[PDB]
Amino acid sequence: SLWQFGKMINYVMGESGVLQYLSYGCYCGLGGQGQPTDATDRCCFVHDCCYGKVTGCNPKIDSYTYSKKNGDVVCGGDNPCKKQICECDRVATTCFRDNKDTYDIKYWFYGAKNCQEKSEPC
Secondary structure, three states: OOOHHHHHHHHHHHOOOHHHEEEOOOOOEEEOOOOOOHHHHHHHHHHHHHHOOOOOOOOOOOOEEEEEOOOOEEEEEOOOHHHHHHHHHHHHHHHHHHHHHHHHHEEEEHHHHHHOOOOOOO
């Protein structure tokens, strides 16, 4: 669920991470539009497309199984649809970490009005 995605982000990126990442660029959140602004936003674009591949279960709402030990995230569980959701979230979080050095606060709470161009499709 997105609740869990936030908890994951906070664990991997730190306490400021939910607010830092879940309005950023054109795609960090869900249901973004336009062109990804940078690599972090591309993490979010892929995450949104990842959720779009989850057909069995609701990636926004449904609760998955995951571990948080020594600073990282491993997905688990024996419901493969929920694990698929978890992996979308985990991947995104690792992508955020990998791209932290190009995080630009210009894109923090950027706003849909700055993304009104043609959307890149999944």
